[PDB]
């Protein structure tokens, strides 16, 4: 698509391998923010999008939150709060004709900025002057799309780059897309480490009485810890109760004395752990 | 140096056609928008028409039905095809390219660089 | 296809209270036997809710704003609500949004629909008459999903728009009430989330004629504002919201969301501070004297040649830029480097004419 | 447009040479890995050999006695000087390049673009 | 330690990069302490063919 024509793809209900597209040598620009690159696989997602489009070459810098520019203000606005990934390549080989590619166009005028993820694909005629259009070009009147002329005799900078921005939700819904590890059995009553759709944890896993609303998949105590939390393979609820912890006392005599310690479990019965209670 | 030449003005029979030109050097049009204006002895410059670089046309609305403007980018040169020419069609015609880019202030016309304009005159003969 | 309505009856619209309604869950977790404070775009308590009536001659579908967000209250019998318009001029220039429940699916487009005056369903007495818009050109989004949907039924919706995202929240309930809002509280249950990515600032209830001219079913409903403000919201030890505090609506809840709590015991508690807003800005500034001679530079009797081209200084004077720029008798003003209008605004060194 | 085409396939004798060429047009060998591919009637594609771009060969273990794989950059042109053809050399002739760079789809045979491939038959006459 | 790099992958010198330099050729510590020294070399490592 153009750039202020952006096209948007519901990515949902399929497993993503992301180390198939970072570790790929074809994408000159490769920017995440929020997440780690490395650590995509190990995420599982909600409300995935793509927005694809094309744009000119020293214009990727403006593909990033906080951004100024002619495409960042008047075509793609990206949020401060942005969590994704900013994917480009150069495309010169496709893009370009000998003549000029003319079939790419961007929003050079705009009468106020974009709000975030806005998409503005109205065509009147813009007033750069005192005089009123009304709809009709004339001086300082002018249609606001104007087109990119790519050429492949252009310098690296004028040529054309195709952008792919990934657009997650982190771990606030029930998710759709996950990476490709494999789900192990599930292991209830023992303290295990556990993975629930990229939360990670250590616990142990029991049958919970609480009902969870269809929208809601995990609780927070008042520590805003996950206190509960729903298999994403059978639709039961856990209770994750933490690990047992418990202080540990060293009772001794002075050195001097002796080397003979008793230790104390504080808040622990002695059937998990000369035995006291 | 920037620097826009016109050609092909003269005397015209009425009902005639007449073929303009804006042979321009010193830049190209893949890149930039072109227009045309008239002036009138007795009126101010009145906006003809515009040529974008993807080869997109605007007219103006009381003037479509008789004008035409089209490039040669390979002889990087404008053209405009008048037909019909009547006596307030008589005017000095200025070819000028559009400045969508920095402007320093107002402009009451919006170009950065203009023509010296060839004169055409509608009479008996 | 359009139809004008002209046999309408003139009525201004009603209004009424809202009471405890238009809470609604801020996210997807689940929480048990809290209190959380949380700030949002939420409907407030007691506020003026509008009230449209559809009764036989009454068919109220106005141009209402949209504004940061919008509850929608429908006191339904027999199925005359359809579906709402959102957009900005409601034509082909702008992309607009259009939600339908007609007889057999809820469908969602965002197109450049070029709409009725009247948008409107029809029921024949079976459902065989739609006219909302006369053309559909570019469509981006569409989404076909299963049906949403004396007074019986009370049909709750909050639309929120942040980000290219709408947000939709949905609450059905069983009532058996007559003519006005029923006072309770009901937390409304999230219901869809729309990647549309479009300005709304106007909306449309779309409602059915009922055809056998036109009549009006009987139907009822309420619009309401959303603002940004902080609710104290309780979860019972079931999850459910079961209680709700406005924490600007009077100085008692006010004292519960500063103590995070319920229940006030009795004493004295500073819970807030009173401010005075200002009212106008007042710019004192001395007195605009020495002038810079720029009349004795335009308006000078003999100009020089220009090899010989004559050159002053202006300094130590303040320069009225105003009176230049807004003369007619110069026929040209070229400016590099500054703004005309922003030369009053600057402050200048080694000035020469 | 990246297009592969072979040419050169034929009749030829048992225990005799035969030429092939993979004329490439649409990229050039300077940058990419290309490999050589059999497909014989009853079995499956069969790896014959790889050129790099330094000049590196690797071929099929089973098959190094009887191939030559050479680049002809002036002409951007790959060679596969086959020898000693006998009756289980009836093949038709791949030459596709491999997507080091990326994999789009889990491919099993690691190639992006394909060759229509030529017929070379081996037989009495 | 000195080697030669493609022109745009002097960007994956330095320490947290990642790239095909940075995870297959040549690693540096997130704790480094020293300089990284880079240069044309088109008249020195580059021939006709
Ligand atoms: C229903 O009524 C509306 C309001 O009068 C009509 O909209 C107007 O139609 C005329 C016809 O050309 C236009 O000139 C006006 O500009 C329209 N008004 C607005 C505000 O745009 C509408 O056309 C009527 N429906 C039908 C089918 O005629
Ligand atoms: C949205 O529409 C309103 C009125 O139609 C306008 O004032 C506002 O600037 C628009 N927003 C954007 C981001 O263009
Ligand atoms: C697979 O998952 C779905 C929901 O995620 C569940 O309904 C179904 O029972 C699961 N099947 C198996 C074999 O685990
Ligand atoms: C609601 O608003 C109307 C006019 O906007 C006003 O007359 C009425 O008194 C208001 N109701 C309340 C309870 O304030
Ligand atoms: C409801 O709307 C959908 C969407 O256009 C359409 O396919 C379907 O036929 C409609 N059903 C009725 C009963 O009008
Ligand atoms: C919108 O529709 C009109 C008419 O169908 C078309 O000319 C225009 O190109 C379209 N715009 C986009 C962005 O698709
Ligand atoms: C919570 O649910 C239980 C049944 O699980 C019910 O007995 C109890 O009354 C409910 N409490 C509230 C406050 O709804
Ligand atoms: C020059 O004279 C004209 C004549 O009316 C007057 O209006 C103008 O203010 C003078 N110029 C200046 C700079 O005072
Ligand atoms: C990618 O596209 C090209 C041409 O569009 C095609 O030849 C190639 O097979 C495609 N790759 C995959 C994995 O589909």
């Known amino acids: 698509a153009s750039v202020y024509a952006w096209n948007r793809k519901r990515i949902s209900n399929c497993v993503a391998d992301y180390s198939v597209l970072y570790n790929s040598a074809s994408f000159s620009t490769f920017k995440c923010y929020g997440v780690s690159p490395t650590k995509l696989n190990d995420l599982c997602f909600t409300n995935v999008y793509a927005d694809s489009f094309v744009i000119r070459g020293d214009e990727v810098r403006q593909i990033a939150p906080g951004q100024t520019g002619k495409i960042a203000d008047y075509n793609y606005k990206l949020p401060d709060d942005f969590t994704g990934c900013v994917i480009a390549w150069n495309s010169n080989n496709l893009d370009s004709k000998v003549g000029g590619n003319y079939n790419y166009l961007y929003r050079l005028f705009r009468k106020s900025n974009l709000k975030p993820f806005e998409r503005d694909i109205s065509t009147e005629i813009y007033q750069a002057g005192s005089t009123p259009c009304n709809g009709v070009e004339g001086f300082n009147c002018y249609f606001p799309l104007q087109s990119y002329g790519f050429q492949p005799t252009y310098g690296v900078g004028y040529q054309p780059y195709r952008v792919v921005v990934l657009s997650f939700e982190l771990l606030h819904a029930p998710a759709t897309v996950c990476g490709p590890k494999k789900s192990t059995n599930l292991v209830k009553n023992k303290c295990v480490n556990f993975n629930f759709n990229g939360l990670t944890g250590t616990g142990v896993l029991t049958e919970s009485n609480k009902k969870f609303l269809p929208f809601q998949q995990f609780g927070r105590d008042i520590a805003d810890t996950t206190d509960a939390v729903r298999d994403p393979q059978t639709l039961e609820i856990l209770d994750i109760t933490p690990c047992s912890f418990g202080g540990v006392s060293v009772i001794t005599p002075g050195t001097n004395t002796s080397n003979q310690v008793a230790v104390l479990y504080q808040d622990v019965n002695c059937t998990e752990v000369n035995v006291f209670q | 140096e920037v620097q826009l030449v016109e050609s092909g003005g003269g005397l015209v029979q009425p009902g005639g056609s007449l073929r303009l030109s804006c042979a321009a050097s010193?830049?190209?049009?893949?890149?930039?928008?072109m227009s045309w204006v008239r002036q009138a002895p007795g009126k101010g410059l009145e906006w003809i028409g515009r040529?974008?670089?993807?080869?997109?046309?605007s007219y103006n609305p009381s003037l479509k039905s008789l004008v035409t403007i089209s490039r040669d980018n390979s002889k990087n040169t404008l053209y405009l095809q008048m037909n019909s020419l009547r006596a307030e069609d008589t005017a000095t015609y200025y070819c000028?390219?559009?400045?969508?880019?920095?402007?320093?202030?107002?402009?009451?016309?919006?170009?950065?660089?203009w023509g010296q304009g060839t004169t055409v005159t509608v009479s008996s003969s | 296809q359009c139809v004008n309505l002209t046999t309408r009856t003139q009525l201004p619209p009603a209004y009424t209270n809202s009471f405890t309604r238009g809470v609604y869950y801020p996210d997807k977790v689940f929480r048990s036997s809290v209190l959380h404070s949380t700030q949002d775009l939420f409907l407030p308590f007691f506020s003026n809710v509008t009230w449209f009536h559809a009764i036989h001659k009454r068919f109220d579908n106005p141009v209402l704003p949209f504004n940061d967000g919008v509850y929608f209250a429908s006191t339904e019998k027999s199925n005359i609500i359809r579906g709402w318009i959102f957009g900005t001029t409601l034509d082909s220039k702008t992309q607009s949004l259009l939600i339908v429940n007609n007889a057999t699916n809820v469908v969602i487009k965002v197109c450049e629909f070029q709409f009725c005056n009247d948008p409107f369903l029809g029921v024949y007495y079976m459902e065989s008459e739609f006219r909302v818009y006369s053309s559909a050109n570019n469509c981006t989004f569409e989404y076909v999903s299963q049906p949403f949907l004396n007074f019986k039924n009370l049909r709750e919706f909050v639309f929120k728009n942040i980000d290219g995202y709408f947000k939709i929240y949905s609450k059905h309930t069983p009532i058996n009430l007559v003519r006005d809002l029923p006072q309770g509280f009901s937390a409304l249950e999230p219901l869809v989330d729309l990647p549309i990515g479009i300005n709304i600032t106007r909306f449309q209830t779309l409602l059915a004629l009922h055809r056998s001219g036109w009549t009006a079913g009987a139907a009822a409903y309420y619009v309401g504002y959303l603002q940004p403000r902080t609710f104290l919201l309780k979860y019972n030890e079931n999850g459910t919201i079961t209680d709700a505090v406005d924490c600007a609506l009077d100085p008692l809840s006010e004292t519960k969301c500063t103590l995070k709590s319920f229940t006030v015991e009795k004493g004295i508690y500073q819970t807030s501070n009173f401010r005075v807003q200002p009212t106008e800005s007042i710019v004192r500034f001395p007195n605009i004297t020495n002038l810079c001679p720029f009349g004795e530079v335009f308006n000078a009797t003999r100009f020089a040649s220009v090899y010989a081209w004559n050159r002053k200084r202006i300094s130590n004077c303040v320069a009225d830029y105003s009176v230049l720029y807004n003369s007619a008798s110069f026929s040209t003003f070229k400016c590099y480097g500054v703004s005309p209008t922003k030369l009053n605004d600057l402050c200048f060194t080694n000035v020469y004419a | 447009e990246v297009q592969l085409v072979e040419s050169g396939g034929g009749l030829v004798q048992p225990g005799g040479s035969l030429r092939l060429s993979c004329?490439?047009?649409?990229?050039?060998?300077?940058?990419?890995?290309?490999?050589?591919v059999r497909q014989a009637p009853g079995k499956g594609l069969e790896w014959?050999?790889?050129?790099?771009?330094?000049?590196?060969?690797?071929?099929?273990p089973s098959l190094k006695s009887l191939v030559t794989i050479s680049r002809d950059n002036s002409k951007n042109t790959l060679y596969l000087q086959m020898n000693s053809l006998r009756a289980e050399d009836t093949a038709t002739?791949?030459?596709?390049?491999?997507?080091?760079?990326?994999?789009?789809?889990?491919?099993?045979?690691?190639?992006?673009?394909?060759?229509?491939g030529t017929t070379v038959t081996v037989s009495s006459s | 330690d000195s080697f030669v790099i493609r022109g745009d992958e002097v960007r994956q010198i330095a320490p947290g990069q990642t790239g095909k330099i940075a995870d297959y050729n040549y690693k540096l510590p997130d704790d480094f302490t020293g300089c990284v020294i880079a240069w044309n070399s088109n008249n020195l490592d580059s021939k006709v063919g």
């Open positions: 000028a390219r559009d400045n969508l880019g920095y402007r320093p202030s107002e402009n009451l016309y919006g170009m950065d660089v």
């Open positions: 010193g830049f190209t049009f893949d890149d930039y928008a």
């Open positions: 040529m974008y670089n993807n080869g997109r046309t």
